[PDB]
Design an enzyme around this catalytic site. Structure first.
Site, PDB file in Angstrom:
ATOM      1  N   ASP A   1      27.450  -0.861 -12.801  1.00 51.10           N
ATOM      2  CA  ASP A   1      26.644  -0.272 -11.727  1.00 51.10           C
ATOM      3  C   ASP A   1      27.059  -0.842 -10.362  1.00 51.10           C
ATOM      4  OD1 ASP A   1      24.700   1.396 -10.589  1.00 51.10           O
ATOM      5  OD2 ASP A   1      23.054   0.015 -10.946  1.00 51.10           O
TER       6      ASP A   1
ATOM      7  N   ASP B   1      22.899   2.164  -7.917  1.00 55.30           N
ATOM      8  CA  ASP B   1      21.924   3.261  -7.985  1.00 55.30           C
ATOM      9  C   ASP B   1      21.077   3.261  -9.268  1.00 55.30           C
ATOM     10  OD1 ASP B   1      23.757   4.339  -9.831  1.00 55.30           O
ATOM     11  OD2 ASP B   1      24.393   5.956  -8.497  1.00 55.30           O
TER      12      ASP B   1
ATOM     13  N   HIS C   1      -2.294  -1.723  -6.150  1.00 54.90           N
ATOM     14  CA  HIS C   1      -1.785  -3.090  -6.400  1.00 54.90           C
ATOM     15  C   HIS C   1      -2.956  -4.082  -6.523  1.00 54.90           C
ATOM     16  CE1 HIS C   1      -2.818  -3.979  -2.242  1.00 54.90           C
ATOM     17  NE2 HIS C   1      -2.141  -2.902  -1.887  1.00 54.90           N
TER      18      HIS C   1
ATOM     19  N   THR D   1       0.812  -1.222   0.000  1.00 57.19           N
ATOM     20  CA  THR D   1       0.000   0.000   0.000  1.00 57.19           C
ATOM     21  C   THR D   1       0.837   1.261   0.000  1.00 57.19           C
ATOM     22  OG1 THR D   1      -1.865  -1.157   0.981  1.00 57.19           O
ATOM     23  CG2 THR D   1      -1.797   1.201   1.307  1.00 57.19           C
TER      24      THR D   1
END
Ligand SMILES: CC(C)CCC[C@@H](C)[C@H]1CC[C@H]2[C@@H]3[C@H](O)C=C4C[C@@H](O)CC[C@]4(C)[C@H]3CC[C@]12C
Ligand SMILES: *[C@@H]1O[C@H](CO)[C@@H](O[C@@H]2O[C@H](CO)[C@@H](O)[C@H](O)[C@H]2NC(C)=O)[C@H](O)[C@H]1NC(C)=O
Ligand SMILES: [Ca+2]
Ligand code: NA
Ligand code: NA
Ligand SMILES: [Zn+2]
Ligand SMILES: [Zn+2]
EC number: 3.1.4.39
Length: 784
Positions: free
Chosen positions: A664, A668, A304, A154
């Site tokens: 990477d 990030d 969702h 949520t």
């Protein structure tokens, strides 16, 4: 010190004095007479015939009096019952060419109607169950589904909706989380979540306020009933021009609450869905009463979906670990593990991961170090994300050690049951229009455009959703190159090289500018959006952009036809590496480094297996086509190159492939600078990639081949982790046909993801509009 004439006041009074706003209950700070004056409930939410033209009784919940329209506090069916009008739902769709707002309204207001746990497939229940929702969906603009962010919980998704940011960037990484800098815990229940320190980015209501657009209070205390929330928005819309907000939000707890108790496809879920639709009907009836039904833009959006999850499908960490009392778990549809106490030499997270990896045959979760999770999840760059993460299988839970709930959510965001809804309705949205599915990170830019606002920097791609809207305030422009390529000819002799490995004079037109561009660069050259020096290298079967800094290609482009034959590497060319006369010895790799590094080996970006002739096969063994590869990874890569590329070409009527390395190391999601590269091949300046990408493009119209495509393109892409083992794949001892494709499907990606990670910009020379290209770049091939 009372709520006389202040119920749901838009201003928020500072402490200590009592409040009458939306959230005064949530702080336990309301005035003595808040429930008396503001939570009126007498005689329900509907006018009846006997109430028509009643004198105002101020104890009623809503009114049927002749003064009610001006205040905006009529019951929503007043004009249907007392003035012989129809319900909104019974009226036919009429195209809203321009906004039709009453006097005072300088812009169309935005109503965000967010429904918790509204799974996409619920839309199939139709106008039988949900007449009002089906009208909005039919008459307006909608997608099949909208993709949420991970975790599919949520709070992370509501805040992503409001910011356009990934959870890792906005900071709300879960419903529950611990922050080691604060040394405090955030929880869905409790008072700690109200502190501003947790919340990053800039949500829509702050963006609005800062640019002079007034916002209603978005959040509602659970005590306030849904009908009271709708009436409050209607009364706020009836305010004077200087007091009136331009943007509002309604939040509903259903169908999530009922999905948790009964699961997604219970017969019990019909009632929640009817209640939600009835509430939508009240809003649309309310707006029609105020002559705002052809004025406001409405967004029906979910946070969702919901999956079947029961107590009997629970994995316990005590069945895998011997010391579950020394660790802290965020349990459920995802796992996050942490040391219980600080200062513990016993605690090594790498041993914990190993202890949780492929230990039972039917094991229903997979452990990861957070930086090794699929890049599409964007779930690593935040100190509140624990190092150890468990991706749990759909339909399962994880708990620490050893019913009322039949449903849950929070799983991987490409899982079909986690997908949610989008519907747009109003003057600015298109009429009777279906759009392809998209990610909820894109909505914040859309909502900024619906209010005339400049969005704050966010992770949406501004322009990618222009096709949702009738008129577009934002026109996307393609960024310019920062670095122009060099195009070196033949410069040095093969005698003058010395790269430490054994393996043209007749061919003048060797590696020249011919039809390479038209055959193998179908959508123009990739633009380099950062400062570097690099060379373009042409060949018979492929083109590439060779970095002189990183000593390898940034990208390699080739086109395999449907009828292309696969061949083998000959025994004489198995340990073959040729120098490239177009590139200097100083800017080339050497084979000596890969002999010194026992762990590391090498592979090729353009596959020697797919070469067009025995002559052209020698181009694939150039040192400029070579990149660092772990033996473990070469099993995956060799299978992709030898087997899967041909398969895709055969399936899609030819494919164009663009492959390359990604660095990477700080996880990030962005291109590393050379400073941030933390690993090189033994005793050399050749850097080790953290990932390898490929972008596989073809014609959406599969009846046309990939190199003669008129219309839209279809794309699928991946970002494969470049790891020294295959511990992620539990079946990697079997033939590559039993596990390599599953690994690639797990690491599917958007072209946009690869652009952030590489500093490249693709699809610059096509016959499609730039807007259509931005949608193509934000597409994820889900494999569901
Ligand atoms: C019934 C409960 C679940 C509702 C609780 C809502 C709660 C999460 C809200 C209430 C106040 C919100 C903050 C407020 O709007 C202002 C800001 C400034 C902005 O720059 C960052 C966000 C923040 C701190 C809001 C976060 C969400 C809060 C706490
Ligand atoms: C998601 O968007 C945010 C904001 O545009 C990006 O975070 C910014 O990153 C830059 C460069 O590292 C910093 O200068 C800013 O401080 C960051 N700002 C904020 C608000 O976080 C982030 O990189 C984007 N994520 C991806 C994967 O592209
Ligand atoms: Ca990086
Ligand atoms: Na080696
Ligand atoms: Na394995
Ligand atoms: Zn929810
Ligand atoms: Zn829930």
């Amino acid at each position: 010190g009372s709520c006389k004439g202040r119920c749901f006041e838009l201003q928020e009074v500072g402490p200590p004095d009592c409040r009458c706003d939306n959230l005064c209950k949530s702080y336990s700070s309301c005035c003595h007479d808040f429930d008396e004056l503001c939570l009126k409930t007498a005689r329900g939410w509907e006018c009846t015939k006997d109430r028509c033209g009643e004198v105002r009784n101020e104890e009623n919940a809503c009114h049927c009096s002749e003064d009610c329209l001006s205040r905006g506090d009529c019951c929503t069916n007043y004009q249907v019952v007392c003035k012989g009008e129809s319900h909104w739902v019974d009226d036919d769709c009429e195209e809203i060419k321009v906004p039709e707002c009453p006097a005072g309204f300088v812009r169309p207001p935005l109503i965000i109607f967010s429904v918790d746990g509204f799974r996409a497939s619920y839309m199939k229940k139709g106008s039988k169950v949900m007449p009002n929702i089906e009208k909005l969906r039919s008459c307006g603009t909608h997608a099949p589904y909208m993709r949420p962010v991970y975790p599919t919980k949520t709070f992370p998704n509501l805040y992503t909706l409001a910011t356009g940011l990934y959870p890792e960037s906005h900071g709300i990484v879960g419903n529950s989380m611990y922050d080691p800098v604060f040394d405090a815990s955030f929880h869905l229940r409790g008072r700690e979540k109200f502190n501003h320190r947790w919340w990053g980015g800039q949500p829509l209501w702050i963006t609005a306020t800062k640019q002079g657009v007034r916002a209603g209070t978005f959040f509602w205390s659970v005590s306030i009933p849904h009908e009271r929330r709708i009436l409050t928005i209607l009364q706020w819309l009836s305010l004077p021009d200087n007091e009136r907000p331009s943007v509002y939000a309604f939040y509903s707890e259903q169908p999530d609450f009922s999905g948790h108790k009964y699961g997604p496809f219970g017969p019990e879920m019909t009632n929640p869905l009817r209640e939600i639709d009835k509430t939508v009907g009240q809003l649309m009836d309310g707006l029609k009463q105020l002559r705002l039904h052809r004025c406001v833009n409405v967004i029906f959006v979910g946070d969702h979906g919901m999956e079947d999850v029961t107590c009997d499908r629970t994995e316990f960490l005590s069945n895998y670990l011997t010391n579950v009392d020394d660790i802290t778990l965020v349990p459920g549809t995802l796992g996050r593990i942490r040391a219980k106490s600080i200062n513990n030499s016993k605690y090594d997270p790498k041993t914990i991961i190993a202890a949780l990896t492929c230990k039972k045959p039917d094991q229903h979760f997979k452990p990861y170090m957070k930086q090794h999770l699929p890049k599409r999840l964007h779930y690593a760059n935040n100190r509140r994300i624990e190092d150890i993460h468990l991706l749990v299988d759909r339909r399962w839970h994880v708990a620490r050690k050893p019913c009322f709930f039949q449903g849950d959510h929070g799983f991987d965001n490409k899982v079909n049951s986690m997908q949610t809804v989008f519907v747009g309705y109003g003057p600015t949205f298109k009429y009777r229009t279906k759009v392809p599915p998209f990610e909820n990170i894109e909505l914040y830019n859309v909502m900024c455009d619906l209010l005339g606002l400049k969005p704050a920097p966010n992770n949406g791609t501004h322009g990618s959703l222009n096709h949702l809207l009738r008129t577009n305030t934002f026109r996307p422009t393609m960024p310019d190159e920062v670095s122009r390529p060099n195009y070196p000819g033949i410069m040095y002799l093969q005698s003058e090289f010395d790269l430490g490995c054994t393996c043209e004079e007749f061919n003048k037109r060797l590696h020249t500018k011919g039809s390479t561009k038209e055959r193998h660069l179908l959508y123009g050259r990739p633009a380099v959006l950062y400062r570097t020096s690099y060379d373009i290298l042409y060949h018979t079967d492929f083109e590439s952009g060779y970095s002189e800094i990183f000593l390898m290609p940034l990208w390699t482009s080739y086109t395999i036809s449907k009828q292309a034959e696969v061949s083998s590497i000959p025994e004489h060319l198995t340990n073959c590496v040729r120098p490239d006369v177009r590139v200097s010895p100083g800017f080339s790799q050497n084979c000596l480094a890969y002999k010194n590094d026992k762990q590391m080996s090498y592979g090729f970006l353009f596959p020697p297996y797919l070469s067009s002739s025995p002559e052209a096969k020698y181009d694939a063994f150039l040192v400029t086509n070579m990149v660092p590869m772990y033996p473990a990874f070469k099993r995956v890569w060799a299978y992709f190159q030898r087997v899967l590329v041909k398969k895709y070409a055969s399936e899609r009527n030819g494919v164009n492939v663009i492959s390359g390395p990604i660095f990477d190391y700080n996880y990030d999601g962005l291109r590393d600078t050379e400073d941030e590269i933390k690993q090189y091949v033994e005793g050399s300046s050749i850097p080790v990639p953290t990932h390898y990408y490929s972008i596989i493009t073809s014609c959406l119209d599969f009846t046309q081949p990939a190199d003669k495509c008129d219309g839209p393109l279809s794309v699928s892409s991946f970002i494969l982790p470049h790891r020294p083992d295959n511990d992620e794949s539990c079946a990697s001892s079997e033939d590559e046909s039993k596990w390599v494709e599953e690994l690639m499907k797990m690491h599917t990606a958007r072209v946009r993801d690869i652009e952030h990670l590489t500093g490249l910009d693709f699809y610059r020379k096509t016959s499609r509009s730039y807007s259509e290209i931005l949608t193509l770049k934000t597409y994820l091939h889900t494999y569901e």
